[PDB]
Amino acid sequence: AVEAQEILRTDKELIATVRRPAEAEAHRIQQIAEGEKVKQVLLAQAEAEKIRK
Amino acid sequence: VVERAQQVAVQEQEIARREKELEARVRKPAEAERYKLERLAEAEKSQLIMQ
Amino acid sequence: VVERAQQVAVQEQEIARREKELEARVRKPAEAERYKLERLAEAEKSQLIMQ
Numbered sequence: 609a610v611e612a613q614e615i616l617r618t619d620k621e622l623i624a625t626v627r628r629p630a631e632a633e634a635h636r637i638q639q640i641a642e643g644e645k646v647k648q649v650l651l652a653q654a655e656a657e658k659i660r661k
Numbered sequence: 662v663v664e665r666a667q668q669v670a671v672q673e674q675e676i677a678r679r680e681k682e683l684e685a686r687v688r689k690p691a692e693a694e695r696y697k698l699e700r701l702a703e704a705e706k707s708q709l710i711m712q
Numbered sequence: 713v714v715e716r717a718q719q720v721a722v723q724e725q726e727i728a729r730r731e732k733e734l735e736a737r738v739r740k741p742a743e744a745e746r747y748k749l750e751r752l753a754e755a756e757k758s759q760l761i762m763q
Contacts, residue, residue, distance in 0.1 A: 613665035
């Protein structure tokens, strides 16, 4: 029974330790990727119209 | 057995604590950085087009 | 003879103790690592596609 309670505790600990940080990291990566994509698109548009003019 | 059967409740509260703390320290800074990058890129485009 | 005939019961409890402990220290960490790899790979794909 000691080890069964330890199983439950380590399940919850692994959740709080790696499962949620993984989701937070995924959200951070996708947010930063969105920012970088918008920045690159705007810079490319600026360069293209520079070349056109 | 009692010790471990209550440490499981400690971790049950810890999971939500990590939820909140990780959100505050990761998701909101990421949103703020994305907005900062958006605005600075818009300013750079506005400057480059008219230069 | 009595000593050994009770050490066999000691090991009879030890087999289930090893069951539980090995599950906790191997199977659950493996599941957590698989989920972490899944989510990080999904994030990397989401970033690479739009870059």
